[PDB]
Amino acid sequence: KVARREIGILTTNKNTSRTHKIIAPANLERPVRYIRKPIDYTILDDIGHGVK
């Protein structure tokens, strides 16, 4: 115990951890279906000083 106390002074925690190579997200991205919708020139009207 005396010997270990003497060398303990010269030590500090070696912050090492262990994880997985790949960690998937909790919720995988949902496949969004394609739906055709016409060009709309009003979608920016509420951004900044818009003009209706």
């Binding site: 115990k1 270990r4 303990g8």
Partner: peptide
């Protein structure tokens, strides 16, 4: 997990 034997 601290090691008291090394004075921790």
């Amino acid at each position: 997990r601290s090691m008291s034997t090394f004075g921790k």
